[PDB]
Amino acid sequence: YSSVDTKQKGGALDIKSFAGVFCILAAGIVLSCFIAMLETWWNKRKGSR
Amino acid sequence: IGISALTITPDRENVVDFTTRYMDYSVGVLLRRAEKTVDMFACLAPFDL
């Protein structure tokens, strides 16, 4: 008979429902770190810095 | 004679003889008039701690 196991009752947001936004920041951290790493590696090979 | 807030029930009808009922029973609810005030911390309610 349960039409939906709502579990929501107070109407708050939670980590499970929000973390899709945290994935955007985590992707930003990843890409910016990899840019820094690749610049710092290419500083072995540019000839100027 | 018995007279009080006494309900006709068959188990009692095995130890007393009731007259015809003079009043109809029911189950009721008593409630205080409902509050409307907004929670002092509704300002933080949108997110869980």
What is the DSSP track for chain A?
Answer: --S------S--B-HHHHHHHHHHHHHHHHHHHHHHHHHHHHTTTSS--
Angstroms from A39 CA to nearest CA on chain B? 40
Q: Name the amino acid, one letter, at B49.
A: L
Q: Find out whether B47 and A15 touch, Cβ atoms under 8 Å.
A: no
With H, G, I as helix, E, B as strand and everything else as coil, classify residue B47. strand
Query: Nearest 5°: CA angle at A22, between A18 and A24?
Result: 120
A14: closest chain B residue by CA: B48
User: What's the resolution in A?
Assistant: 3.7
State whether B47 and A13 contact (CB < 8 Å): yes
Angstroms from B34 CA to nearest CA on chain A? 19
List CB contacts of B16: < 8 A, sequence separation 6 or more.
Answer: B2
Torsion from C-alpha of B17, B23, B27, B30, nearest 10 degrees: -130
